[PDB]
Structure formats: structure tokens, C-alpha cells
């Protein structure tokens, strides 16, 4: 398990979790309060 | 003793070198009158892949 | 060496059917190179130009158009079969020149007879700028 | 108003563009049945389109002769004529986020280089450390001016030169 | 002609997943330049360069080919599935000429 | 007709001599190094300007440099 967690700490995997967060956050930020252009 | 101490860090002053104004460990020093006795080892590689090079007394100075 | 070995232009050649990488009109007109060596048995080796050939027990001789084609073969024989080849240079006039083991010892081993050539007593860099030699040739010499 | 631009509420081409974009959906809506899912999808798009146009008008935007909204960048005219949210305020929002990425990566680089084998820490990250710094960077401007006024931000001629 | 197998040659564990570049002697040292990264993804499946043994090269090849089949079969099953749940096959089947196919709803 | 100059930083590795195919580099004794060896370039007329030697040099910067210049039949590697 120590080696599995180490594999998960590689660059390709940590980047995959980052991408799901940033993309998931932005798509969710467009789904709610739809299509923003001016900021109030 | 002719030169810096074993295991002592020193800063390089060759303008040609990849390691210029950079720090490296002194691996050894020869006291037989050679022109470039001081052997130095750095962690960072150069462009070829070599991490050691023999420098001179005047070309090296104290750290930082 | 003790003495330069003169060329024996009539020695048996390897068993090789022929190819298209052989000699061209430059060889008869300008110069060509020939290599000699002595093998203990009958073996197979890769030629620089073309395919495979069979050596012959005893002296062997080839003819090439380039020095690199010859030295490429020495590196193969010295490594694979552990032999000691020697090659010459033949001009169109018939003159012959003995090139590679010119001292008898290969260049990667020191010998007392040799004299240094093109030896600058300075560090790389540390040489004059081109402006100082602007109107004649050479900043490195 | 400013720069010879009309507000989007008073413009005719702005409303012309609304009547056009809705007419495309109404024609597309005629094909399908009322209670079907394609009908619900197009009605939602109709609802979003009607909301996009009224919100841009309500926000005091400026529409040109073509009928499309234009943005203003000078903070003086933006603040004078109430157009600050367009560009002037988006600039501060981004800089806080951009600085956060810099202050975080700079700290992970410095701290891993204080240990043995920093090369391995780049390809195989220390995720507990990276998350720690990522949640400590909310006040990145304070640390920068703290590090500038102190002098431990910049290096001093211990860098490689070429000549 | 007969069957010939060697039992339990390799242990299965994630130890080498943590150590990239294990297959090559040069890469197992570790990275000091970013060129080590490009060489890694490139020399990964060049089994002939890893080792001189023809046997190991054969074991690696015969097992990697089993991967491409699994990769194909989930791809092929995806088309059947995506054609079942997100398509108009039953409608196209009754009027093929006028109706067009559609397996990718957005 | 290329130019090959070796500088004061040579350490007698012999890797330059082993590499260059055309036998344009040989080793000569010298008192400057630990190995008591130095290279030389007696026959540059046979230099093809491949520049393999410079690659062999394992010093911070090259003690052997091949300054390209005027060409010739031997330098251009022409079998014809
Ligand atoms: C061939 C060109 C080249 C290549 C291949 C690289 C490659 C790399 N560089 Mg780089 N670099 C280059 C040129 C190049 N560089 C040049 C020309 C310069 C100018 C000198 C730099 C300057 C530079 C700097 C200053 C840095 C790099 C770094 C890196 C590494 C970054 C890896 C990474 O992004 O971490 C992973 C990707 C991420 C997005 C990390 C995000 C982490 C977040 C906080 C995790 C949160 C997500 C969470 C864990 C998951 C939740 C998901 C859930 C919702 C499901 C990488 C190996 C960086 C490094 O050292 O690595 C750390 C570094 O700081 N480079
Ligand atoms: C399965 C296929 C696959 C693919 C497509 C990739 C693709 C990639 N790997 Mg890799 N990897 C794989 C398998 C794979 N890997 C395997 C089997 C291993 C052995 C465990 C590794 C181990 C490995 C290591 C050790 C490293 C990579 C790195 C990289 C990236 C190269 C660096 C770069 O160009 O961006 C340069 C990046 C910058 C200049 C700044 C960082 C910003 C990045 C782009 C954001 C993160 C992108 C994110 C990962 C994309 C999502 C993944 C994507 C494939 C869908 C690249 C995206 C390098 C890396 O740093 O990853 C990012 C790296 O160091 N991989
Ligand atoms: C930072 C990333 C992020 C954030 C903040 C949210 C936030 C939210 N998601 Mg969500 N989601 C995400 C990523 C994210 N999601 C990703 C990557 C997927 C793909 C698997 C989904 C798939 C998803 C579904 C299917 C649903 C949500 C729903 C929701 C809402 C309630 C749960 C909530 C506001 C639910 C919702 O719509 O709220 C009613 C819901 O049905 N999400
Ligand atoms: C300089 C490049 C650039 C810039 C400046 C913008 C800027 C913007 N885009 Mg765009 N986009 C770009 C590139 C860019 N994009 C590219 C290359 C594509 C094609 C891939 C798109 C595709 C795209 C789509 C499909 C949409 C946008 C949208 C938006 C707006 C939504 C902002 C938001 O998420 O609400 C606010 C979010 C926050 C305040 C949270 C972020 C700050 C964190 C949470 C802190 C925004 C003003 C949306 C829009 O409404 O259009 C006007 C939208 O629908 N973009
Ligand atoms: C290079 C950047 C730049 C440029 C080209 C302009 C250009 C302009 N500004 Mg402006 N401005 C800027 C940056 C800039 N601004 C910044 C960073 C601020 C601080 C937030 C301001 C604050 C500002 C105010 C408060 C006002 C202007 C005004 C003006 C206009 C009249 C000329 C002027 O400045 O007075 C002459 C300047 C001589 C040095 C002109 C369009 C005036 C305006 O509204 O014009 C009608 C006005 O009242 N500006
Ligand atoms: C902490 C990481 C980091 C930091 C603090 C900086 C900082 C800086 N960079 Mg830079 N750079 C980085 C990474 C980083 N870079 C990487 C990974 C690359 C390879 C793509 C580059 C390539 C690069 C170039 C070509 C240039 C700069 C330049 C600059 C300077 C101006 C800002 C800019 O526009 O850059 C550009 C910004 C990018 C190219 C985006 C970088 C990619 C992401 C967004 C940043 C990486 C964050 C890291 C992966 C996350 C690790 C966090 C950790 C906790 C895991 C500035 C001081 C410019 C300069 O020379 O200054 C005058 C310039 O020309 N950078
Ligand atoms: C009826 C006998 C038989 C059958 C049906 C197959 C079938 C197959 N062999 Mg094969 N083989 C056989 C005898 C057989 N072999 C014998 C006797 C030897 C040694 C003398 C070999 C040695 C051999 C090698 C070295 C390789 C194959 C490979 C393959 C696959 C190539 C995939 C392809 O391109 O086509 C179409 C693909 C398909 C139709 C997919 C079908 C997938 C299922 C699982 C096929 C299972 C049938 C299997 C042979 C029966 C045994 C299963 C049982 C022991 C549990 C294929 C499925 C290649 C491989 O490994 O594939 C990855 C490969 O490199 N075989
Ligand atoms: C093997 C391998 C790997 C893998 C990779 C991959 C595979 C990647 C990718 C991936 C992908 C490919 C991803 C994607 C993602 C995400 C997304 C894509 C998103 C999202 C979400 C959302 C947010 C949504 C929402 C929604 C909508 C849209 C509408 C409404 C409804 C719902 C809610 C659904 C790596 C290299 C890493 C590591 C090692 C090797
Ligand atoms: C929608 C809506 C809403 C709101 C929302 C929100 C949340 C907001 C926001 C937000 C934001 C915040 C947005 C934005 C904006 C932005 C923009 C608009 C941008 C831009 C860009 C720029 C400005 C740029 C420029 C330039 C150029 C052009 C060149 C140079 C470079 C530069 C970049 C500078 C509400 C609530 C009412 C509800 C209903 C609907
Ligand atoms: C406001 C505004 C404006 C104006 C502008 C101007 C005109 C100004 C400027 C400018 C300038 C003339 C500037 C200068 C200089 C700068 C500098 C010098 C900088 C910077 C940076 C640094 C120094 C660093 C940073 C960082 C990094 C990169 C990483 C680490 C950390 C930190 C974050 C710190 C406009 C209208 C356009 C638009 C709207 C807004
Ligand atoms: C063959 C194969 C496959 C395939 C795969 C694929 C094909 C994938 C993909 C995918 C894709 C192709 C995706 C895409 C995507 C995209 C995304 C996910 C996005 C995003 C992002 C964001 C978040 C944005 C943001 C923004 C806005 C909104 C505004 C401002 C600007 C920007 C742009 C920044 C599989 C694996 C299945 C299986 C095996 C085999
Ligand atoms: S390759 Fe360089 S260091 Fe080695 S013997 Fe020749 S000149 Fe000296
Ligand atoms: S240029 Fe080529 S042939 Fe001439 S000495 Fe250098 S490596 Fe040898």
C-alpha cells in the first residue's frame, strides 16, 4: 500500500485529479448561475 | 597543504563553465604542481551529462 | 613499428561474390586504400560496403576508396576477432603510404617517440577576440 | 453613455437580434411534439436565451450600431459611467488567483530543495505538503511584501552568466 | 511439439509502479534532466532494448497483445451499448431511408 | 583541410582518440596531468569534420574543438 500511494503521488495521476477538480468546478460554475459575462 | 580542504564547498569563476557562480563539493586536490588540480563535483549535470571537472586555484573562491 | 611493412600487392582476397559499393573512377585517377590482416581460421565478417564475406586462413587483402571504410573494418576486427590490421594509401602514380599504425603502436596508447602537434598551452576560451585579427585569418591559432 | 455607444436596452438591433435567435428555435420546435424531451430541451434553451438578453441589458452594458455589447477598459471612464464590473474588477479577481499559483509553487520548490533528492520530489510529489501550502496561500500578498521588504525574495549575483 | 510453461516467474505487486524507468538500466538511476521523461514514454515498449533474452521478449509480447484485445472489446461493447441506450436504431429500422443514424447524444 | 586544436584542460582520457574513425588524433606524453598524457592532431588533412571527438571530451568545456573550414575530397567523404 505504501507503494500504491506512491504511484498515486506520481505526476500523470496527481494531474488527473487536478484536472477533474478544475474542469468539474468550472463546468459546475457554468451549469449554475448560467453563462456569466459582466460580474454584477 | 596547497589548496582548499577536502569536502569543502567552493564557488567557480571560469566564465566558460556551465557551473559559473555556482557551488560544488571539492572531491580532491593534487599537490604535484598540476595546473588544474582542484577536482570539484556538482549535483546538477551539464549539457553532456558530466557532473565533475578539474578547476584551478585562482578559478575557485569561497562560498557565497 | 620496428620497420614499416612494405606492401605485398599479390595476396589472396576473401571469398566475396561482389557488390555495387566497390570502387569507382576516382580510385584509378586519384587514390585508393588497401587493408591487410592475418587470420588464424576461416570466418565470416560484415563488409562496410555490401554484405558478408568469408575470410581466408593467412593474409587477406581488400581495396577501398575511403579511409573511413578501412578504419571501420579495423574496429570490427579488433573488437570481434581481436586481430591487428594495417592499411596503406595507394596513389594513381603507384606511390604507397603506410598510415594508421604509423608508430607501430595504436594511437590510443602512448609512445616516447611521438611529438605533439597543434597543442595550445591555454584553456579553451581565454583567447583573443576576432577584432584583433580582423584583417588576417585565425583567432584560434 | 460614452464613445457614441447606446445602451443595450434602448438599442433596436439588440432586440432585433433577440427576435431572430428565438425565431430559429420556434421553427425548430414545430417539428417535435409538446410533451417530448426534445421539446423540453429547446424550451430550456429558449428560457436561457430570454434570460441572457435581459440580464445584459439590466447590467448597463453598451451596445454599438451592430447591436452587440462593448466593454470599456479605462478605470476612469468605467468608474465615472458605472462600467467597472466589465474589465476593471475581472483584473483584480485574476491577479489574486494568479499570485496564489506562484506563491504556492515557489514555496514547494524552496522547501523540497532543502532536503535530499529534490529531483524525485518533482516527479513524485509530496501531496500532504502540496495541500498544506495550497490551503495556506489565501493571504499571498501579505507574504510577498513581507518577503520583499525583508529582502529574501531575490537572489544577489549568485546566478550563472554567460560571457 | 508439446506444451511448455514456466510457473510463477514474476511477482505481482505495485513496487515497480512507484519506480518508473525500472525496465532500462539508464533510466533506473533517476531524473536529473527533463529528457528522462521523454525517454521513459518512448523506450517503454521497446522490449528488445530492455534485455537480450529472446524468451522474456516473447513473454512480454504475447501478454501485451492480450491488452489490445481487451482495449478493443470495451471499445466495441461501447458502440453496442451507446447504440442501445443513446440511439435511434428502432426508429431507423422502420424508416431507414428518411431517418439518419445517431449514437452520440450530447 | 579542417582545423583541430586541443587545449590545456586535457586529462588523458583517450576517449577522443578511440572515437574519431579517421585516425586524426593520437596520444603524446606530457607533464601537465595525472595520467601524464595529452592528445595531438598531427594529421588533420584526413579530418572529415564529423565532430565525434568533441562529444567524447568529458570536461566542463571541450579541450578539443574542430573548427570547420575549407573543404576537400578527403574532408567531404567522397568515395568518388
Ligand atoms: C521539455 C520542457 C519542459 C517539461 C517537459 C517540463 C516539465 C515539468 N516542469 Mg518545467 N519548465 C520548463 C520546461 C519544461 N518543464 C521551462 C523552460 C521552465 C522555465 C525555466 C520551467 C520551469 C518550471 C518550474 C518553476 C516548475 C516546473 C515544474 C515542472 C514539473 C511540473 C509537474 C506538475 O505540473 O505537477 C502536477 C500538476 C499539477 C496541476 C499539480 C497541482 C497540485 C494540486 C494542488 C493538487 C490538487 C488536486 C487534488 C490532489 C486532487 C483532487 C481531485 C478530486 C476532485 C477527485 C514537470 C515535470 C514544476 C515542478 O517542479 O513540479 C512540481 C515547477 O515548479 N518547470
Ligand atoms: C497512459 C498514457 C500516458 C499519457 C498520455 C501520459 C502523458 C504525460 N505524462 Mg505520463 N506516465 C505514464 C503514462 C502516460 N503519461 C505511465 C505509465 C507512467 C509511469 C508511472 C507515467 C509517468 C510520468 C512521469 C514521471 C511524468 C509523466 C509526465 C507526463 C506529461 C508530460 C509532461 C508535459 O509534456 O507537460 C508539461 C507540463 C507543464 C509544462 C506544466 C504543468 C501543467 C500540466 C500540463 C497540467 C497537468 C496535465 C494533466 C496531467 C493532463 C491530464 C492527463 C492526460 C493524459 C489526460 C504528459 C501529459 C510528466 C509530467 O509532469 O506530467 C505532467 C512527468 O514528469 N508521466
Ligand atoms: C469542484 C467540482 C464539483 C463541484 C463543486 C460540484 C458540485 C455539485 N454537484 Mg457535481 N460533478 C462533478 C464535480 C463537481 N460537482 C463531476 C466531475 C461530475 C461528473 C461525475 C459531477 C456530477 C454531478 C451529478 C450527476 C450531480 C452533481 C450535482 C452537484 C450539486 C449537488 C451534489 C453540487 C452544487 C447534483 C446536482 O445536479 O445538484 C442537484 C447531481 O445530480 N454533480
Ligand atoms: C483569454 C481567454 C478567455 C477568457 C478571458 C474567457 C473568459 C470567459 N469565458 Mg471563455 N473560452 C475560452 C477562453 C476565454 N474565456 C476558450 C479558448 C474557449 C473555447 C474552449 C472558451 C469557451 C467558453 C464557453 C463555452 C463559455 C465561456 C465563458 C466565459 C465567461 C465565464 C466566466 C465564468 O466562468 O464566470 C465566473 C466564474 C467565477 C467568478 C469563478 C472563477 C474564479 C474562482 C472561482 C476563484 C468569461 C468572461 C462562459 C460565458 O458565459 O461566456 C461569456 C461560457 O459559456 N468560455
Ligand atoms: C496607459 C494607461 C492609460 C491611458 C492611456 C488612459 C487614458 C485616459 N484616461 Mg486614464 N487611468 C489609468 C490609465 C490610463 N488612462 C489608470 C491606471 C488610472 C487609475 C485608476 C486612470 C484614471 C483616470 C481618471 C480618473 C480619468 C482618466 C481619464 C482618461 C482619459 C483622458 C486623458 C487623461 O488621462 O488625462 C490626462 C493625463 C495626463 C497625464 C484618457 C482616455 C479621464 C477621463 O475620464 O477622460 C474623459 C479621467 O477623469 N483616467
Ligand atoms: C511555481 C511555478 C512557476 C512560477 C512561480 C513561475 C513564474 C514565472 N514564470 Mg514560469 N514556467 C513554469 C512555471 C512557473 N513559472 C512552467 C512549468 C513552465 C513550462 C511551461 C514555465 C515557462 C515559462 C516561460 C516560457 C516564461 C515563464 C516566465 C515566468 C515569469 C513571468 C510569469 C509568466 O508569465 O510565466 C509564464 C507562465 C506559464 C508558462 C504558465 C506555467 C504553467 C502553470 C500555470 C504554472 C505551473 C504551476 C505548477 C505546475 C504547480 C505546482 C504547485 C505545487 C504545490 C505542486 C515568472 C516569475 C516568463 C519569464 O521569463 O519572465 C520574464 C517566460 O517567458 N515561465
Ligand atoms: C483454435 C486454436 C486457436 C485459436 C482459436 C487462436 C486464436 C488467437 N490467437 Mg493463437 N495460438 C494457437 C491456437 C489458437 N489461437 C496455438 C496452438 C499456438 C501455439 C502453437 C498459438 C499461439 C499464438 C500466439 C503467439 C498469439 C496468438 C494470438 C491469437 C489471437 C489473435 C487475435 C486476432 O488477431 O484475431 C482475432 C481476435 C479475436 C477473435 C478475439 C478472440 C479473443 C478470445 C479470448 C480468443 C480465445 C480463444 C483461445 C485461442 C482458446 C483458448 C482459451 C482457453 C485456453 C481459456 C486469437 C484470438 C495472438 C494473441 O496473443 O492475441 C492477443 C498471439 O500473439 N496465438
Ligand atoms: C492509464 C494511465 C493514466 C490514465 C489517464 C486518463 C484516462 C486520463 C483521463 C480522463 C478523462 C477523459 C477525464 C475526464 C473528466 C471529467 C469530465 C469530462 C467532467 C465532468 C463533469 C461535469 C461537471 C458534468 C456535469 C453535467 C453536465 C455536463 C450537464 C448536466 C448533467 C451533468 C451533471 C452530468 C494516467 C496517465 C493518468 C496515469 C498512468 C497511466
Ligand atoms: C450571469 C448571471 C449572473 C451573474 C453571474 C456571475 C457569477 C458573475 C460574474 C463574473 C465575472 C467576473 C465575469 C467576467 C467578465 C470578464 C470579462 C468580460 C473578461 C475579459 C477579458 C479582458 C478584459 C481582456 C482584454 C485584453 C485584450 C483585449 C488584449 C490585451 C490582453 C487583455 C487580456 C488585457 C447573476 C448572478 C446575475 C444571475 C443571472 C445570470
Ligand atoms: C491598472 C489597469 C490598467 C493600467 C495598467 C498600467 C498602465 C500599469 C502598469 C504597469 C507597470 C509599468 C508595471 C511594472 C513593473 C512590474 C513589475 C516589476 C512586476 C511584477 C512581478 C514580480 C516582481 C513578481 C511576482 C511574483 C511572481 C512572478 C512569483 C513570486 C511571487 C510573486 C507573486 C510576487 C489598464 C487600464 C491597462 C487595465 C485596467 C487595470
Ligand atoms: C479510445 C479509448 C477510449 C476513448 C477516450 C476518450 C475519447 C476520451 C476523451 C475525452 C475528451 C475529448 C474530453 C474533452 C474535454 C474537455 C473538457 C473536460 C473541458 C474543459 C475545461 C474548462 C473548465 C474550461 C473553462 C473555461 C471556461 C468555461 C471559460 C474561460 C475559458 C476556459 C476554457 C478556461 C476510452 C478511454 C474511453 C476507452 C479506451 C480506448
Ligand atoms: S578527450 Fe579531452 S580530456 Fe580526454 S584526453 Fe582528449 S583532450 Fe584530454
Ligand atoms: S573532426 Fe571527426 S575525424 Fe576529425 S578528429 Fe574530430 S572526430 Fe576525428
From TrEMBL, chain A:
The chain crosses the membrane at residues 6-27. One of its GO terms (cellular component) is chloroplast thylakoid membrane. Chlorophyll a 1 binds at residues 28, 31. Chlorophyll a 2 binds at residues 28, 31. It is found in: Membrane; Plastid, Chloroplast thylakoid membrane. GO terms for biological process: photosynthesis. SUPFAM superfamilies: Subunit IX of photosystem I reaction centre, PsaJ. Keywords: Chloroplast, Membrane, Photosynthesis, Photosystem I, Plastid, Thylakoid, Transmembrane, Transmembrane helix. The keyword Transferase does not apply. Pfam families: PSI_PsaJ. InterPro entries: PSI_PsaJ (IPR002615), PSI_PsaJ_sf (IPR036062). It is a single-pass membrane protein. Signal peptide: none annotated. Its main location: membrane. The keyword Chloroplast applies. May help in the organization of the PsaE and PsaF subunits. Belongs to the PsaJ family. This is Photosystem I reaction center subunit IX. It comes from Dunaliella salina (Green alga). The lineage of its organism: Eukaryota, Viridiplantae, Chlorophyta, core chlorophytes, Chlorophyceae. The gene is psaJ.
From TrEMBL, chain E:
Chlorophyll a 2 binds at residues 17, 60. Chlorophyll a 14 binds at residue 68. Chlorophyll a 12 binds at residue 65. Chlorophyll a 8 binds at residue 45. Chlorophyll a 7 binds at residue 45. Chlorophyll a 11 binds at residue 65. Chlorophyll a 17 binds at residue 82. Chlorophyll a 6 binds at residue 41. Chlorophyll a 18 binds at residue 104. Chlorophyll a 9 binds at residue 45. Chlorophyll a 16 binds at residue 75. The chain crosses the membrane at residues 61-81. Signal peptide: none annotated. It is found in: Plastid, Chloroplast thylakoid membrane. Chlorophyll a 10 binds at residue 45. Chlorophyll a 15 binds at residue 75. Chlorophyll a 1 binds at residue 3. Chlorophyll a 13 binds at residue 65. Chlorophyll a 4 binds at residues 22, 45. This is Photosystem I P700 chlorophyll a apoprotein A1. The gene is psaA.
TrEMBL record, chain F:
Its EC number is 1.97.1.12. Signal peptide: none annotated. Its cofactor is [4Fe-4S] cluster. Residues 1-30, 38-67 form the 4Fe-4S ferredoxin-type domain. It catalyses: reduced [plastocyanin] + hnu + oxidized [2Fe-2S]-[ferredoxin] = oxidized [plastocyanin] + reduced [2Fe-2S]-[ferredoxin]. It comes from the Eukaryota. It is a peripheral membrane protein. GO terms for biological process: photosynthetic electron transport in photosystem I. Binds 2 [4Fe-4S] clusters. Cluster 2 is most probably the spectroscopically characterized electron acceptor FA and cluster 1 is most probably FB. [4Fe-4S] cluster 2 binds at residues 20, 47, 50, 53. It is found in: Plastid thylakoid membrane; Plastid, Chloroplast thylakoid membrane. [4Fe-4S] cluster 1 binds at residues 10, 13, 16, 57, 63. The keyword Transport applies. The keyword Ligase does not apply. One of its GO terms (molecular function) is oxidoreductase activity. GO terms for cellular component: chloroplast thylakoid membrane; photosystem I. It holds the Pfam family Fer4_7. Gene3D superfamilies: 3.30.70.20. Keywords: 4Fe-4S, Chloroplast, Electron transport, Iron, Iron-sulfur, Membrane, Metal-binding, Oxidoreductase, Photosynthesis, Photosystem I, Plastid, Repeat, Thylakoid, Transport. Apoprotein for the two 4Fe-4S centers FA and FB of photosystem I (PSI); essential for photochemical activity. FB is the terminal electron acceptor of PSI, donating electrons to ferredoxin. The C-terminus interacts with PsaA/B/D and helps assemble the protein into the PSI complex. Required for binding of PsaD and PsaE to PSI. PSI is a plastocyanin/cytochrome c6-ferredoxin oxidoreductase, converting photonic excitation into a charge separation, which transfers an electron from the donor P700 chlorophyll pair to the spectroscopically characterized acceptors A0, A1, FX, FA and FB in turn. The eukaryotic PSI reaction center is composed of at least 11 subunits. This is Photosystem I iron-sulfur center.
Amino acid at each position: 500500500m505504501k507503494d500504491f500511494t506512491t504511484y498515486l503521488s506520481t505526476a500523470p495521476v496527481v494531474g488527473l485529479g487536478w484536472a477533474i477538480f478544475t474542469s468539474g468546478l468550472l463546468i459546475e460554475i457554468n451549469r449554475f448561475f448560467p453563462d456569466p459575462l459582466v460580474f454584477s | 597543504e596547497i589548496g582548499p580542504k577536502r569536502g569543502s564547498l567552493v564557488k567557480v569563476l571560469r566564465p566558460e563553465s556551465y557551473w559559473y557562480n555556482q557551488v560544488g563539493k571539492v572531491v580532491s586536490v593534487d599537490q604535484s604542481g598540476i595546473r588544474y588540480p582542484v577536482v570539484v563535483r556538482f549535483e546538477n549535470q551539464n549539457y553532456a551529462g558530466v557532473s565533475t571537472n578539474n578547476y584551478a586555484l585562482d578559478e575557485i573562491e569561497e562560498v557565497k | 613499428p620496428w620497420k614499416q611493412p612494405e606492401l605485398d600487392p599479390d595476396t589472396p582476397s576473401p571469398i566475396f561474390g561482389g557488390s555495387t559499393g566497390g570502387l569507382l573512377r576516382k580510385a584509378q585517377v586519384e587514390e585508393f586504400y588497401v587493408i591487410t590482416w592475418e587470420s588464424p581460421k576461416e570466418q565470416i565478417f560484415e563488409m562496410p560496403t555490401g554484405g558478408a564475406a568469408i575470410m581466408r586462413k593467412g593474409p587477406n587483402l581488400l581495396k577501398f576508396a575511403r579511409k573511413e571504410q578501412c578504419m571501420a573494418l579495423t574496429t570490427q576486427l579488433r573488437s570481434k576477432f581481436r586481430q591487428t590490421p594495417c592499411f596503406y594509401r595507394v596513389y594513381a602514380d603507384g606511390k604507397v603510404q603506410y598510415l594508421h599504425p604509423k608508430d607501430g603502436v595504436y594511437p590510443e596508447k602512448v609512445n616516447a617517440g611521438r611529438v605533439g602537434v597543434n597543442q595550445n598551452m591555454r584553456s579553451i576560451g581565454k583567447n583573443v577576440d576576432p577584432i584583433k585579427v580582423v584583417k588576417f585569418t585565425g583567432s584560434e591559432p | 453613455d460614452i464613445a457614441g455607444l447606446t445602451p443595450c436596452s434602448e438599442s433596436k438591433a439588440y432586440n432585433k437580434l433577440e427576435r431572430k435567435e428565438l425565431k430559429v428555435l420556434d421553427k425548430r420546435l414545430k417539428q417535435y411534439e409538446p410533451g417530448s424531451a426534445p421539446y423540453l430541451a429547446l424550451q430550456a434553451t429558449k428560457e436561457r436565451t430570454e434570460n441572457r438578453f435581459k440580464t445584459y441589458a439590466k447590467q448597463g452594458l453598451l451596445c454599438g450600431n451592430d447591436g452587440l455589447p462593448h466593454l470599456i477598459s479605462d478605470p476612469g471612464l468605467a468608474l465615472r459611467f458605472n462600467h467597472a464590473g466589465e474589465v476593471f474588477i475581472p483584473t483584480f479577481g485574476f491577479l489574486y488567483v494568479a499570485g496564489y499559483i506562484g506563491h504556492v509553487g515557489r514555496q514547494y520548490i524552496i522547501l523540497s530543495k532543502e532536503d535530499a533528492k529534490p529531483t524525485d520530489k518533482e516527479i513524485i510529489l509530496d501531496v500532504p505538503l502540496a495541500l498544506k501550502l495550497a490551503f495556506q496561500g489565501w493571504a499571498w500578498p501579505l507574504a510577498s511584501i513581507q518577503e520583499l521588504r525583508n529582502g529574501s525574495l531575490l537572489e544577489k549575483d549568485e546566478n550563472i552568466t554567460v560571457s | 511439439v508439446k506444451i511448455a510453461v514456466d510457473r510463477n516467474p514474476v511477482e505481482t505487486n505495485f513496487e515497480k509502479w512507484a519506480k518508473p524507468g525500472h525496465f532500462s538500466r539508464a533510466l533506473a538511476k533517476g531524473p536529473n534532466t527533463t529528457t528522462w521523461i521523454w525517454n521513459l514514454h518512448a523506450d517503454a515498449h521497446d522490449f528488445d532494448n530492455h534485455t537480450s533474452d529472446l524468451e522474456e521478449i516473447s513473454r512480454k509480447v504475447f501478454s501485451a497483445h492480450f491488452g489490445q484485445l481487451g482495449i478493443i472489446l470495451i471499445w466495441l461493447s461501447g458502440m453496442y451499448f451507446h447504440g442501445a441506450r443513446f440511439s435511434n436504431y428502432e426508429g431507423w429500422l422502420s424508416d431507414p431511408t428518411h431517418i439518419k443514424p445517431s449514437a452520440q447524444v450530447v | 583541410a579542417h582545423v583541430v586544436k586541443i587545449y590545456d584542460t586535457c586529462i588523458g582520457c583517450t576517449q577522443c582518440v578511440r572515437a574519431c574513425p579517421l585516425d586524426v588524433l593520437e596520444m603524446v606524453p606530457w607533464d601537465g596531468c595525472k595520467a601524464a598524457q595529452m592528445a595531438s592532431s598531427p594529421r588533420t588533412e584526413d579530418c572529415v569534420g564529423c565532430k565525434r571527438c568533441e562529444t567524447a571530451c568529458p570536461t566542463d568545456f571541450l579541450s578539443v574543438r574542430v573548427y570547420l573550414g575549407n573543404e576537400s575530397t578527403r574532408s567531404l567523404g567522397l568515395a568518388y
